[PDB]
Amino acid sequence: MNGVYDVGGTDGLGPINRPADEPVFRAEWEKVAFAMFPATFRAGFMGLDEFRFGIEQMNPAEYLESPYYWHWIRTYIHHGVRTGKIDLEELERRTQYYRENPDAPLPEHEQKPELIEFVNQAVYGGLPASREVDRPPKFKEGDVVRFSTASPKGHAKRARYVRGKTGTVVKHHGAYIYPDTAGNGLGECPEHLYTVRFTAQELWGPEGDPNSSVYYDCWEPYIELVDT
Amino acid sequence: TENILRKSDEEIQKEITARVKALESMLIEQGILTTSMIDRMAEIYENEVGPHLGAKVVVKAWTDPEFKKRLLADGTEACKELGIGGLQGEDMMWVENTDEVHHVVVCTLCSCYPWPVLGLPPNWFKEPQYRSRVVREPRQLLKEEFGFEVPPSKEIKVWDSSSEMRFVVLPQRPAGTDGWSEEELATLVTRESMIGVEPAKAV
């Protein structure tokens, strides 16, 4: 989709705010928001590509200025409603309750050890997105290719600043989950993945550094041959 | 930056806190979330996983040419030699800074970061200011934001991490460190030097 989160090349967002030191979690609610991801993933709220698509559908002004982990809360609620797993009216009633009773306890619950075992396995085992497919890669190192001008409204990894641009294939990585399908509830539909190099002048015109390039990852449908 | 429409930070935090506790209570009642699950995730990324792991990889590559070759050929497999890997570093590719090339990593679309070697990203890396600018004027950003002057004749490769490939910068070994131990060398390797926004520490 063409949302404001696609910020590559955007001007006017202001100077970087980089405190000389910062904690991993700035408040207790951030730990909760962070740790909710394995819980909601295991419960079938969403996969990784769908998770990102939920963030992309935020109010753009809220996205630009809200704390990072609030984005995660928005996408949990988005997919909780999508899957019928979160009742909004109940959520709003509970929000008012904890507004008025911030120190009220959380519900009674069992500390199911298998949920912690799940956390440990995911963290140190990973969730690999690589997949085996039937066909060899269509492209190879050194091929000159052009990036698609398609502008889907659903999830994709098609930054506006690379659309229609010509670059050179740097590496073939194998096949991986395809975001244009996975993020839109259409399944993994794995495609071969490449890194493609675009010069700064190709991307930005004459305002481009003559000695800089951007390396961008392209699934196979994103690119078509210009010169072998 | 000033926005006349924006509530105070205190009011924003107060509202977020209630919304998060409310959602937490619902997922707890569904049986899919527990407070012990939350505490475990925080312990891992506060204390167990952080940039000291990537620093170990860098110093091994600096001191073992055969390991450096394996690291550049297959970053995930080489890091697994040291017991390092997992979530959000399933597919690592390490890239070598040289006298002719400087690498810097960004995720313009979605905050991608190699957690197993660096831990969770700092907030500036996730924020729109760095993400918008580094693909467009990396040389100027490095100079103005990080005090890092990359001579104009030197190529800057900006890796925009649009997939599950995770790019990690192998910074050059600082001069004046001949014969240093791996422990001493590690003190020079920062998360910034493995993103590419700074070189490894001088002196």
UniProtKB/Swiss-Prot annotation, chain A:
GO biological process assignments: nitrile catabolic process
Temperature effects on activity: Optimum temperature is 60 degrees Celsius.
Uses described in the biotechnology field: Industrial production of acrylamide is now being developed using some of these enzymes.
Pfam families named among the record's database cross-references: NHase_beta_C (PF02211), NHase_beta_N (PF21006)
Keywords per UniProt: Lyase
Enzyme class: lyase
Gene3D superfamilies referenced in this protein's UniProt entry, alphabetically: 2.30.30.50, Nitrile hydratase, beta subunit (1.10.472.20)
EC number: 4.2.1.84
Reactions mediated catalytically: an aliphatic primary amide = an aliphatic nitrile + H2O
GO molecular function: nitrile hydratase activity; transition metal ion binding
Annotated NCBIfam families: nitrile_beta (TIGR03888)
Biological role: NHase catalyzes the hydration of various nitrile compounds to the corresponding amides.
Subunit: Heterotetramer of two alpha and two beta chains.
Assigned protein family: Belongs to the nitrile hydratase subunit beta family.
Name this polypeptide is given: Cobalt-containing nitrile hydratase subunit beta
Annotated source species: Pseudonocardia thermophila
From Swiss-Prot, chain B:
Catalytic activity annotation: an aliphatic primary amide = an aliphatic nitrile + H2O
Record's function text: NHase catalyzes the hydration of various nitrile compounds to the corresponding amides.
InterPro entries reported in the protein's UniProt record: CN_Hdrase_a/SCN_Hdrase_g_sf (IPR036648), CN_Hdrtase_a/SCN_Hdrlase_g (IPR004232), CN_Hdrtase_asu/SCN_Hdrlase_gsu (IPR023900), Nitrile_hydratase_asu (IPR018141)
Listed GO biological process terms: nitrile catabolic process
Self-association and partners: Heterotetramer of two alpha and two beta chains.
Pfam families: NHase_alpha
Biotechnological applications: Industrial production of acrylamide is now being developed using some of these enzymes.
Higher taxonomy: Bacteria, Bacillati, Actinomycetota, Actinomycetes, Pseudonocardiales
Modified residues (Cysteine sulfenic acid (-SOH)): C112
Positions of modified residues (Cysteine sulfinic acid (-SO2H)): C110
Similarity annotation: Belongs to the nitrile hydratase subunit alpha family.
UniProt GO MF annotations: cobalt ion binding; nitrile hydratase activity
The UniProt record lists the keyword Metal-binding: yes
Cofactor(s) required, per the database record: Co(2+)
Binding site for Co(2+): C107, C110, S111, C112
UniProt keyword annotations, A-Z: Cobalt, Lyase, Metal-binding, Oxidation
Identification of the protein by name: Cobalt-containing nitrile hydratase subunit alpha
Enzyme Commission number, as recorded: 4.2.1.84
Signal peptide: none
Protein species of origin: Pseudonocardia thermophila
Note on cofactor: Binds 1 Co(2+) ion per heterodimer.
